[model samples]
Every structure is written in C-alpha cells, then in structure tokens.
Target chain A: RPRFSFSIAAREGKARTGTIEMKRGVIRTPAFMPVGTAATVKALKPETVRATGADIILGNTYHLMLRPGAERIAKLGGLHSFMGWDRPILTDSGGYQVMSLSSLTKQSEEGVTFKSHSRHMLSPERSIEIQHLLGSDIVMAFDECTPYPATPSRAASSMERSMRWAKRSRDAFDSRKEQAENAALFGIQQGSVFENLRQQSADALAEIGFDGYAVGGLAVGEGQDEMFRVLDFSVPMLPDDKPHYLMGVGKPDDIVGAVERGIDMFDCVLPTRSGRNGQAFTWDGPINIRNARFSEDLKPLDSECHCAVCQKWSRAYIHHLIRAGEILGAMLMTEHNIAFYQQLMQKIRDSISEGRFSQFAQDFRARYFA
Target chain B: RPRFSFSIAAREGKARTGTIEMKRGVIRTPAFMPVGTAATVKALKPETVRATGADIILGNTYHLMLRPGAERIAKLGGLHSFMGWDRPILTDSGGYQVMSLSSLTKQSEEGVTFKSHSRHMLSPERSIEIQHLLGSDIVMAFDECTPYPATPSRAASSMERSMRWAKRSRDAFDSRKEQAENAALFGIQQGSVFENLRQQSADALAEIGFDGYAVGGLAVGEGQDEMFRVLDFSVPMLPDDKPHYLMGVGKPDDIVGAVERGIDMFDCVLPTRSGRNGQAFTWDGPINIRNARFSEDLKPLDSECHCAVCQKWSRAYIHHLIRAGEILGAMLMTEHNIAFYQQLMQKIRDSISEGRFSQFAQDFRARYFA
Candidate 1:
C-alpha cells in the first residue's frame, strides 16, 4: 500500500468518510490543504498552518520556480525542507498562474511558454521539470486556465487545449517517475462554467490517468454560488477511487459545500490572505480586526479554538496590530485563519466519520451564511 | 521612596545599581525603556512590550499631542489607558520633535511654535499642555535640541534659550494636575558638543531642579565615540540623586556602553525600527532574516529568550515572513528585540549587583561584537 490511501470509513448519501496515510502523516478524508503559495502560506508559519490540524499544504511551482528556482529548492532538499514543513506538499501545476499572471504567454503541444513575473523565462516543460525537482509529494500537470467571463467557445477551446496539454503533461511526468516514487501527478480539469466541457475534460484526463484530479477554474473570482453549482455536477465524474482535489477554493462555507459534494481534498488562499487583512474566521462569522469595536475587545477571535494566537492574543491586541500596521497583526491573523481552516477540515472529517456530515454542514452554513 | 527612584544596588565606578519605583512598577537602575512614540512601541503589542521587562516606556508628547490629540488621550482616561499600558510612561515634551521632526517652527518664552507634519499648528505651551493632559509619569521639560556642528557661541545661545524654557515647562507641568496626580518632570540639558556649555547647561538645569536630568546632545549622529567622550564628563556634572537619561540612542552596544557610563535610563527606536526591516537583535549582534542562509535554519532568534516569538517560532519561519513582506515579521522581531533588551537590562542589574559589571560587559561585547 502507498504511504497514503483511501478507504471508506463511513458513508451517508453521497458523503463518505475516509483517510489518507502519507509516509510522514495521515490526512483524514474531506481534508483541507491550506495554500502555502511561494513556499509559505502568506503570513502563517508552517507550524501554525499545521496546528490548524492540516495534514498537507499546497506550494506554488510558479512562484518558487521564478524566485528561488526549482533547482534551488531541490538543492535546499525540497519545498517541505526549504520551508521547514516536513509534511507532504502538493505542487500546483502553475498552468493557472502563468496564463493568469504572466505576460505574453503562448501555449503549444509540448508546454506553456511565458515570461515570468520575476524576469525569468518559463514554459510548461520547465514547470514540470521544476515541480519534479522541487520534490513535490503531489505534482500538478501543466495546463491552461481560460479567462473568467470567458465565452463558451473560448472556454471550450481552452478546455481542449488544456486536455491535449494534460496528456503531454502526463507523458512528461511519466518520463520522470514510477507511480510509487517521488510524487503523484494530479491532473487539473479546466472547463470554466461549461459542465459538458468540464465533463469532457475530466473524462479525457481519466483516460490519460493521473494519481488525482482537481476541480480547477473555479474560485478564481467566480462567486461561491456559481462555483458550488459546478462542483455539484462535476465532482462525481472524476475517479472516485483516486484522490479528488478542488483548487483555489474558497471561503469557509465554500470548502464545506465542496466536501459535502464529495471533494476528498481542497486548498485555498482565503484563510491566509484574509488573516493578513485582519479578517478572522469564527464559528459565528468573519471578523475584520480593523473595526473600531475590536479596539477594546479582549476576547479571542474564537474562544473555543486552541491555537496560540487565540490562546495568547485578544481582539484588542490584534486590533492594535492592525491599526498600528504592525506585522504581528497579520501573523496572528494568518495563524488563526489557517488554524481555523484546518479546524474546519477536522470538523468535516469528524462529522463524515460519525455519519453526521449533513447536520454539521447545515449547522456550519447556518452560522457562516452571509 | 517612589516606585520610580534610584538606589545604589552596586557600583562600577560612578555606574551603580538602583531601582525606580513608580506606581505601576519598578524599573531597576540602568534600565532601558523601549520607546513607545506615537502611542505605540512600533511593532509590539503593549503587553509584549511589558513582558520585555520594561516597567516603563517613553512616549512623544509632540506626536501624540498632534495626531490622537492630547485632549483625546486625556478624555480616553490618560495615556496609560488610551495606550493599554498600565506601566509608567515618560513623555518627552514636544520641544524636541517640534524642533526636529516638524516643519514651520517659531520660538518664544511661552514655548516653541511649529506646524505639525500633520500640517497642524503647535507650540511648546501646547506641547506641555498636551503632555500634562496625556498623563505622563515622567514629563520632559521643553527645550530646543542643540543642532550638531554648531559653533560654541551658537550652542550656548540655544542652550540658554532652552534653559529659560525649561523653567517654563516645569511651571506648566506643576500647574496641570486635573487628572495627573504626580507625573515627574525631567529637564533637558542642551549644549551641542562643548564640555563647558554642557556643564553650564547641566548646572543650570540642576539649579532649576528637575525630577531628573537628560543629556540631550549626544547620540545625535556624533557617533558613539564622541558620544562616549561627552558622557564621560557631562553625566557626572549632572546631579547624582536624579536619574540620568540619554535621548535618541542607539544600537545594542551603545546602550551597554551608556549603561556602563553611569547612565540610568535610555530610550531609542533602533529595536523597533530594526524589527520592521528584518534585522533581529540577539546576544550575538544583529541577524538579518532576509539572508538566504536563514531560509532553512530552524533555530529561534535566541534559544534562551522566553518571549512568545522565541518560545514559539523559528528563525526560518520569521525569515520567510520578512522575505514575503508579512507584517508578522516586524511584530515578532520587535517583540524579540524588546525582550532581548529587557533581558540585557536584567543581566546588567544582576552583574552590577553582583559586582561583576566588567566581566558581564566584556562577555557581552565578546559575544555581540562577533
């Protein structure tokens, strides 16, 4: 058996409980891997990111490749070691970031070619090579992300290109490893909002084969309602026996909905990014620390949470940091947010295992609905 | 004795051990108060600042008087409550900031007049009025800071004008007690770099009889060597019973040198400012977290420190924060540096009391100079 494998721990309706046992650790089913883009989860320390009970984190092959370089990370001994987090790290295929962020990108049959934001030349071939060199536990296959508000024809064309490239990505990845070796390659399904195109992309990837599949092209400025609509119909078409991942998702309730829709894994920048912005997640609702009321409030963001930020800091102190523009504000916020998301993941896992995921999701949505 | 008083715990030449007992806490002699200008100690939370072994902190009457408005702090229940610091606070009269940091200035017997960088108008009379309203424990007498590279005659004239205003500041402070029960007053001795002028200034301030005396003209970019030369003579000339203060100083080594030179109190922004820039002060000089070498180093800033940052985070993690431009970098670094200073003060107290002053200083210089 692999370091990580899934077994049906419990089942209720379409929702089921499971677990992923990696060499270094175990990730309970319906898990959330908080985003650690650019080798960090924004303001959060890796341990604080982990203390939230996260079993894994996602690293950006794009950002790391441009700044520190993939070979540099390999020299440092891998993204986890370079960042000092020894847990499994999933590397994003960087296809989304390149098409979205880099200027002058042109895709071809072999891979993506673009000028990196960091003044470096990049391509799909380089990305796959870098992610492998970065020693990713899970490597994403490079593909293209069509722009949002995209025309259906544009989305369809982009989807086909990505699917064709997805095959090339698999071939490129195959040239590097045995299925049991360095890292698992995950294929991203990008068809924007077109369900048929999404299904086609997913089916094509399934035929090509990847260790896991991600519901990509959502959570990229598309609102949660629309994203959930896609996930509702799109998730079941992927390989259920393999890992199911949803990338760049989402606010608290977004992840819960995806998990309920049968997402086995998820990652997002909301918790870490919002934390830096002084936004905190609680069972009750989101709190922005810059509010005047927090200036004197001494209570924790979540009194029940057990992380060091909640344990040692107060609304007043964190508020002070925000007002003063102090770094600790972002630090504590990032810590709390990551901890919160991990806590959310833990809650999802616990509920699914206990055969109470429906009730948990209902209660969670009741509290967090905006 | 008052909570803020000087006692000879031990003596290394004129340098001696003592404690300042103020209502909030006792600041051991040769104490270093982390500066909390603008109602904040830069990147630190008030409690974290307190935990750095600082029984007291210095505030700027000029800045607070201008921005938050002294009237605002006073109505908010004095500087202590307004800033969430229950400890004793020493506030410098707006004279220094008005003469230095502000624009559009004028001087009269009433007090120096200037326009706030906030583009608001202010005067020394307003400055004293504000500090009194802010409820400072130790109020500095209003005086113009002597300009460096000035002729002896020019320095003497400035010093004389400052001397006259010192008396006025004392009178103004004595007059305000509506909410301030017994905030002490310290007179500033100003005389560019001339020993005779400094002696004259000191003697005049002694005659005016402040609660304490400040050696104002050192650490003004004259360099540490020249500053030491002035301290060699100027501090001894000031009264022994009163606490001796050196303003706007300095690096870690500078603090040690002044503490060694019979100085009992000091304030500076090096620790706070350095924290924002990713340089952390440990016993072994300053470590820049931005250095690539720290990228994989998983050690605390100082393993022996008990601050929350050192207790909880790794240098590698903080290094990531700095490189990523996370605000937590400043917060953690400031907390660590402040704690380091506090720890240094405590060590100084122990050494002075144990009559091991030279040994401690030598060892500190050896480790830090490395």
Candidate 2:
C-alpha cells in the first residue's frame, strides 16, 4: 500500500474497521480523532491525549495560520514536532472558520477575506499552502460549509462553488514539492439536508478525486436525525476504496450512526468542550459533574470505564475540582471524556470485526439515551 | 521510628539532609512541599504533583474549610483520599490566611473572629480539630504571624500570645482519640524580626512541647537578609531533634538560605503563583515567559532541569500558551517550577549528604541570582 493509504481490515454491514497508514503512524478506524485546536488539546498535554488512546488528532488551519502563523511553525520544525505529538495529524482547511468564526468576512469567486487578529485572506490556494506549511498528515481541501436551513438552489450553488474550490485546493496541494509526497489531501462534500444536492456534492468531489472524502456541513446544528439522513444518501456516493471522513461530527450516538452509514472517520469538539464544562460522556448518557448530587458521590465517573481517570478518581473529587474551578478538574474530566470516546470507538471497531455491529449499535443507542 | 519522627541522616556545616517518617509515607528533608491551597494545587493534579518528586504537599486549612467545609472533607474520607494523593500531607492552621485574607478579622486570646463567605471563628483548638479532620500527617499549630517591623515590646506580647495558642493547639490535638497517634503537631515561632522575642517564642513552644518547630513571621516582607538574620538567632533556639519548618518560605534562594541557616521543611506559593503569571524559576535566575525574547526560543525553561515540561516543551510553546491565556500554559509552567524546586531540594540533600552543602550553596547562590 502507498504511504497514508486507507485499507479496511474488517467489515460488518456498512461499519468497517481499518487503518490509515501514514509516515508517522497508522490510525485505526472507525476512528474518532480528537481536536487539538491551537496546538494543544485544550488543557491536556500531547502525551496525555495520546495516552487516552487517540491515534490521530485534528488541528484547525484557521487558528494556526492566525496566531503562530503557518510559515513560523514550518520553520520551527512543523506541527507534529512543534506540538510534541509524533502521531498522524489531520488538519481542516481555513474555509470552515472563514465562514463561521472570522468577522468582516467577504466571499468571492476566488476565495474569502476576513478580519482575524489582523485582516487575512483565505483562498483555496492559500488554505492548501498553509496546510502544506503546517505539514499535516491529512490535509483537508478548502471548501465552504453550506449553511443549514438553505434552499435546495442555495445549497446547490454553494456546493458547486466548493467543488470548484476543491479543484483549486488539489492543484495547489500537489504543486508543493516535498509536502505532496507525505501529506494526503481529503476533499469535503458540502450540501445542506437535500439528497440531490448531497449527491451532486459527492459526485463532484469524487470526480475531482481525493485521497479521502469527507461528509461535511451536516453537524452544524441540523440535529442528529437530519445529519444521519444526509449521511444515508451521501456516504455511499464516495469511493469505497478510500476513507470517508465525517468532518466536525458529533455526539457519541451520532458517531455510531454515521459509522453504521459507512463513514470511516470523525472529529468532534463535544467530548473535549463538554468535559471542560463538567460533563462526562458515559455508556448511560452524559452526566454533569457540577451537579450538587455528585458532591459526596464516592463512585467513579463511569463504573464501566477502565481508564486512568475512572480507575483512580471519584465523581466527588472531580466535582470539587470543577466547582472550585481547578484546572486539574478539567484535565481529569477532559481526559475521561476523550478516553470514553476512544473506548466507544474501540468497542465499535471490535463489534464490527466480530460481525455484530448492528446489535452493538442498537444496545448502545438504547442505553446511552435511556 | 514513631509517626512524624524527624531523623537527621547527614549534615554539612548548618545545612543537613533528613527524613520525616509519617503514617502515610516518608518525607525526605530538607523538603519543599508544594502548597495546594484548596484540595487542588492550583493548575496541577495530585499525581502530577507527586510525579514532580513531591513526597508531601501542604494544604491551606482556611481555603478548604471555607469551600468544602472541614467536616465535609472528614466525612468524604480526609484530604489524602479526597485529593487522590496517597502521600503524606502537612496542613497549616488557619492563622495566616485569617490574618492576611479574611475581611473582618478580630483577634483575641482565645481565637479569631472573621467574615469570609460567611461568619467564621477560628480558635487554636478548632484549628487543631480541623487539621485532625483533614487527616494531616503533619499538623501545624495555630500561631499569629506577627507583622514585619513591629515594636520590640509589641512583638514580645504577640509571641507570648502565640505561645499560649500553641499550647491550646497541642492540647486540642492530643484530645482527639486516634488523630494524635498518626499526626505530628508542629509549633510555629513568631517574633517580627526581634531576636529576643523569637527566643522567648521558641522557649515557650519548647516548654509546651511539639513533634516539630517552624520559623514563622520571617518571610512576610522581612526581606531575605532580615529573614536570615532572624534565623541566625531563632532557629537554634528550637530543639535540634525536631523537624524545623520554615512557613511560607520562598524563592529558590530563600529555601537555600533557610536550609543553610538550619531549617528543614518549607512550603510556599511562589512556584505555582509565579507560574500562572508566566514567570519561570531557573538556576540562572527567573525569566518571564511572556517576554518577546522567548517567542522563538526553542530551549527548555531550564536546560539543567530534567522535568517533564522541560523535557517535552520549549520556551516558545509556553510563551504562546501564556499569551493565548490557555490553562495548559499555567499547568506546564507550574509543573516545571514544582519539579525544579523538588529537584533543588534533592540537590541540596545530595550536597548535605556529601558534606559539601556550603560549596553547593555558594555555587547556587552565585548563579541563581546572577
């Protein structure tokens, strides 16, 4: 297999377990890569994040390009060495943040312009060039996220524009001398809740061709039902030979649903963000550690969890840390949440390998929301 | 040896290395116990604190009592189990914070009346009782920290009052059924830079009897030179067999000076506090990571130090974290400082054991302040 190749090791229904062989390391699937925005995974160290069973981590091109600058990081020995993580790092293009976060933004046929810490421009060429400078293992193509609640015509036009941007991103990415050999580019499909639009987006991305295909623009508050419905029509349209990444998705159940619909990879901020907010994702749904009842509760955050956080600390201790606004509390909580997500993925992989994915997902869905 | 027994293993000049045996674990001296003001040590976890070579940690009775309540911690299985640190813990009586932080504090012969989140009273007896409730391996007696530059006569009266409170604390500690057997009570000497008052304070405390003695009232804005001068007369007044704890002491140089002047254990908020503020302590003196000079410096905080933070990160990364106001920057910086302190103590111990403490101190003092 080629370097950064995606190969399925096992399959049960549409859910498959595989590995993305990268120069640094192999990321086992159906993978749930933790987001390490701004280089660090919030309060966690790189080793700590890796210790929670993370094979790959996601970094945002938008944040990195603004603060530390892409050229600065590249000069300082690239993202992997700079962040102290030697594992595979998948970075999304600046397009999503350009649409969502950047202020005083303007989009044209060429690209989008926005005001950040200072004014910045993010064309497809610029996005791909920055990702190259970041030395990302998996470089996502620059594509606009079609806003939710859009008309079919609006979504189609947005998707068409993204397809054109994807082509430009691919051209820029391959033009880079050394980066093209090591880094694999993934194209994002953007269509808001319409089957025909979604199909058109997928066909366009597949026609342009990418090392991987991402089902994007769904988890932006369209609800899980709508997200999974879009995935149902969209996921299979991507080539089966390559990895299918569902970008910025999702809750635990949402991940399970997407995986069942043939999605091969996911990245989300829910576990990490919610962990900092005192929420713990368990097999029996999420519980807030800040709640008063946990003040004297001697039990672990999750009885079934065998992670270091669960094995050592009690809910009471976590509650105190969170309530007291201690960083250790957030560290422990975030560690456990990340661990739980990785554990969920592990179980999902095992179930798929054992040909009981549907049954496993069913039981998990029932209990997780019970 | 019995619980909380201090044994001198080696000595060089006035500097020495020893160990404090307690029920939970052994604390090697001269030790630098990190201050965990509340149950948590600011930005660090208990395990991380321990991994930084900390054998014992100090908790502030004032903060814990106010936030979680003393009874609540006792009910929840004490500070060690509560914070997930299986090591020995030394907790200060509420005296210092009561004087320094409390809103409306009024002192009397019996106790102190203060208003915090609510109306609270902290007597010498109650202080010992709370320390017992926290299950401290080493408990400090409630002694008033006489302010710096007090009149000789005023200092004498304050010292005498503290001496009386020390007796009350001892009585209260012994009155507890099993707590007395497991925990050692240390009496503090308060004298506001007056040699005669400190002598009187020490004599009174010695007559009262305690497992240990602490040189208090020195590090409170007395300046390093004045503090050392106080130690010159005061430290020798206490029993040599007992552990000599220097309360709320200080920078690296302060600890080194205290050890040379025959002090044993020390606890301070310098490393943790300065860390949050982007200050890093080094043998070549302290450096502020917030400085633009460190923006691209790839070197560790201290090249001589082998702490995890130093081993894994660069000054540039820490600079970014602090500038970005990320909690992780504080965590890494604080962890490195604590490790540096513990490493310093270990070096001091090694020097004392090798009978070259004077040389070590001389060399350290020259470079550390340069």
Candidate 3:
C-alpha cells in the first residue's frame, strides 16, 4: 500500500467522491472531520467519534501544545497513542488559535508571538515541530487566517506572508525525515475574500508544493452568500489532483455548498459545540432539545438517523437530561450531531457518485432550511 | 423466573455469598449498586454501567420526580426503557431527599411536606406509587432518615413513625397489584445510632413483613466507628433469610466492614460524585487525579484494573483532562471508579465464597488505609 495517495472514484460537476489513502487509514471524501478540540470530541469518546463514521479527526495544535504539552505527549508515545485514537489525525497550525484565543498577540513576517500562560512564539518551524512531535498524519502549514472583511492590500499582505510560511512549513516538515515519511503536509490558502489574492496565494503554494491545499479564512462571521461567492472563484485556483480542504468550514448547509464547489474535506465545531448547548441537527434542520415542547416528544432527535443515540433514546429523555444539565445529555447530543454530519457527508458522496449531487443539494437545502 | 428470591451460596461467619434472583436479573450478594440519581448514571451510559459489572442500579425518586417526573418516565415506557437500562433498578423512597435537599420541610405522621420548586408532599403511599410508576425492581419503603446523634427519645419517636410508614408503604405497594407482582419492597430501619431503637425498628419492619430490610440513617455524619457499632448489633436483628441493604453506607472500608456484619447490598454516590471531582479509586487507595505530580505520569489510573479507560488512557491524560475541566474527565473517572467499586464487590464475594473474607478484608484495609 502507498504511504499516501488520493483517488477520485467519481465526480459530478466540480464535486467529487474519492478516497484519501494514508498509512493509518483511508478517509472517504467529501469527509467531515469532527473537531477533537482538546484531544477529545468533547463529551464523546474516541471510539464513539469513530463510530459516527469518522475516518479522521482534527486536533488543535494550540490547545494540545498549551496543556498536555507536545513534549509530554511525545514522551508518552504521540497524540494517537495518548488519546487512544489510532486513525489518521489532522493537526491545524497554531496560527488560527493564536489569532483568536490568545492575549498579547503580535504577528511578524517571521511568525506569531502570543501569550496564553507565558510569552510563547510559534514560528512555522516550531509549529511543524509540534505537529511532528504530536505525530500528526496530516500536518497543516502555519498560516495567518486573515480576518474577514479585510482591505485588499491587508488581505494581499496576509496571503503573501502565509505563502512564505507555507514554504517554511514544507521545509520544516521535510527536515523531520522519519515523521515526513509517515506524514503529509498541507498548505492553507489565506486571502480573506479577495479572488485575485486567493489566486496569487494558490499559485505561490503550488510553486512551493504540498501534499494538499486548504481554502482557509472564510467562515469567520462571513455570511453564507459571501463565503460561497469567494469559494466560487477561490476553489478553482487550487490544484485539481490534490485534496482540497475548507478549514473550519461550517454548518451542514455550508459543507453541502462547499462540497458542491469542489472542497473534498472540512472540519468544524458546530455539531459538537451546539450539541453541548442543547441544539440537535436533524434532517429537517437543527432543533433545541431543551425546549418544553420536547418534554413529551417521544420521537428520536432525528427520525431518519440510525445512530445508537437516535436508535434508542427519545427526544423527551434527552430534553429532560439537558434541562437537568446531565453530562449524558451533552454526550448523546454530540454523538447524534456528529453522526448526522457524517451521514450528510455520506449522502453527499453517494449523490456525487450517482451523478445526482445537484438534486441532492437542492433537496437538502429545502428540508434543512425550510 | 421468580419475581424475587434470595439464596445463599456460601457463608463465612457473618459474611455471605449469595444471589438475589429477580425477573429482570440476578444480583450477586454484597453487590454495590451505582447511583443513577437521575434517569442516567452520572456521565455513563447504562450499557457502560452494566459493562462495569453492575447487576442493578439505583434511581432516586426525588431527582426523577422533580425533573422528568415519575409519571413522565412511566409514560415513556418506564425508567428501564427511558434510560435504556433493562437490568433491575431499585428506586429509593422520596424520604431521604425530602430531609436533605428540600427546604420549608414540615414533618408529621402523614409524611414529608417540603419545597423544591413548589410545595410538595410525599406520603408513604405517594412514594410507593412513584416507585411503582417508575417500574422499580426493588422499592424502598418510605421512612424518615433520622438525623445522626439524636436523643434516645427522638430516635424512638422517629423509629416508631418510620415503622408506621413501613406498614403504610407495604399496604400501598400491595394495593398496586400488578406492580407488586413484579417488584419487591424493602423496609428501611431508621434509629439514628441508638442500639435498642435500631432493634425496635428492625423488629417493627420484620413484623410488617418486607421482602428485604435496609439499615438506613447511619451513614449520615455518624462517623464510621459509630456506624459500624450500630450495624454490628443492628444487622443480626433483621431476618436472616432476607437480603440486607445498607443504604448510603460508605467508603470502601465501610463496605467491607458492613459486609462482614452481614449486609447483602449497598449503594452510595461517593464513587460517582467523587469521580466527577477528579478522585480515582485504586486497589491501594483513592488518589486525586488533579495532582500536579500526574501531569507527566504515564501509568494508567489503576494498573490492576481492566476497564476500557484504564487499558487505554494514561494517568497523565486523565490528569490533564481534569485540570482542563473536560467532560471526558468526569466520564472516564466515573467509569473507572464504578469499575473499581464493582471489582471490589466481586473480590468481596469471591473471598466470602472461598472462606477467606476475613483475611481479604484485613489486607484490603491495610493497603487502602496505608
């Protein structure tokens, strides 16, 4: 078997059904990677996450590096062994979190410097090192997630810096000979909403080269129409052969739209986070399980779902759990939502494989956004 | 299968190995029932709780009746179907929580009248009715959990009232003819650490004729020595053929002592509640996993244990999870503790069956207390 390979089994328009074959496992596309923010998919166990049809999960480099440091995980035998997740794990660069979560932040052409506990710096080299130490299967290039609604010149500057960082990330990843042999590096495109800058960023990353490409920096408070408009032009600029990822991209609708535009992969916190706060995703759309109307609603969270949570538990029981603030409420809701997302992705893949993706998307939007 | 029957398999002095056979399941003697205060065991799925070797779990009439309501659970096909636990469930009478959790309490011979959300009343009949509605396998008779250190006069008066309630509880339980055929009712003896009062309470309950007997009102801040002293005399007064339950009676050492004193069943929230607070039980003793020393410790929570959490996760990871306040911390810790408790119960039963319970108890205390 190849250490790393991707094959498109079928395609409808720009949307494709394929497989990203890695040493750990094969990830089916279009795949939705559940966000295991702190080495866990929140309340769900690793096995539970995998049971939701997740071939791979995404870990935040910033969260792991801060607590349970990368060094400690490496000493214990990497994030896979430490977290008991043996499948392929994609680790994002610490760049996005440094921008969003940290205080006393400073950005330079070299890299980012921020304070979480103490003053810390995450150069592209250091970010790659952390990912390698964590034994990431797919290593994301350290890049600035340019703030949305940026000026053209600011977006260009951010995109240019990110391209430089992508080259550095590639070099750093390659320098770790053993890790590089087992892992793949991905470059992230960052140009805010500017099509020309996105094109320039993609061309720069193509010149530098990477195993995959991520269409980054669009889901940050941007409306769906604007994000789709940017993706309309931006996605085409990325390489046709490599896997295209939409970083931190979306609700089920956003994922459906992004997959329609050519994104083969995505990672998001919506399902897990919203589930914890009592929101449940269903075929007809999201519903808050804590509503009083569900107090006697004996139906499952999603009638069409076949997940263990949905198969056995009723909405009324989950409603009571959430109202009482039981941890099982969060656990069950998160499991169901993850299952729903994966189910959606599976449906999307099937629709594309059958050459009916447009109709599937239209029907999905009709029911989900009704 | 019998609705309820008990037979001793082996006896070692006061310590005995037996099985309480019920329509739902057979519970081995000296069993430790995990506290599922609400419909679900805190942070664990019913299957996971069963996987930990729990033959039966306890539900609180107070918590359930307050949040989801016993009627609601009955409407949802009873708690067994509602919580997905098909095994036997023993529901406490609303008496204990009425004293501890509610405010504006007014106690009379009729029953407890207290306030949580609204002014509520729980007579012996009401408690029995709620337990029947919840489809409990074992229904504890409604009785006041007399506060510790009560004067002999107060203790006598409380015991007499509880005895009166026990008779009423039996009448109420028997009136629900269909439910009575499937369920067994246990009367609680409440004497508040007074020897003669305990004997009086026990005699009164036995005269009333219950399927089981519980030595209640002892683990209520009376200290272990006082509790054990009371149990030493109190346990032998109950019917020898009936299963003896020690309600809310203690730590691991307390359990070993009570078992030696002939208690056949036990239930406590210590393992579950303490687990959520970062405490872990081991064969050696309990340790707080949040200690800084565990930050890089690579050992499992308990090397001797075979639980999924212990087999897969390191102490360092659990320590980090606890520090980060991750929900998985509670889930894993509660699971391990539940597993540990069940394992301890298994060891106790085995020792009794093998005629070495005394040595086992001594060794357990030496290591645990050391």
State TM-scores per candidate.
0.83, 0.98, 0.99
Ranking by TM-score: 3, 2, 1
- For residues B1-370, could you state the per-residue lDDT of candidate 2 as single tens digits? 4676788999877777888888788889999999998888888878889999999999988988888888989999988898888888889998988989988988899899999948898999889888888888888999888887789888888888898899999899988879888888899988888777778888989998999999988777878888888888888899998889999899899999899999998999999999999999998999999999997889999999989999988898889889988879999999999999999999999999998889999999899877
Q: Which of candidates 2 and 3 is the stronger one according to DockQ?
A: 3
Which prediction has the highest DockQ against the true structure?
3
Supply candidate 3's per-residue lDDT for A269.
95
Across A1-370, the per-residue lDDT of candidate 3 in tens digits comes to 4668999999999898999999999999999999987888899889999999999999988988898888888998999988889999999999889989997898898888889848888989999999998999999999999887799998898888888899999999988898789999999998898878888999999999889999989889899999999999999999999999998888899999999899999999999999999999999989999899999888999999989999999999999899999999999999999999999999999999999999999999999889
DockQ of 2: 0.78
Q: Candidate 1: lDDT of B307?
A: 80
Model 2: how far residue B281 lies from native, Å: 1.3
Q: In model 1, which regions exceed 4 Å deviation?
A: A7-13, A16-18, A51-55, A118-128, A149-184, A207-211, A274-324, A332-370, B45-56, B69-88, B118-137, B151-154, B160-184, B207-211, B278-370
Compare the candidates by TM-score and give the number of the best one. 3
Regions more than 4 Å wrong, model 3: none
Model 2, position A188, has a per-residue lDDT of: 91
List DockQ for all candidates.
0.24, 0.78, 0.88
Docking class of 3: high
> Model 2 off-target regions past 4 Å?
none
lDDT digits (tens) for residues A72-101 of candidate 1: 667656677666688888888787887778
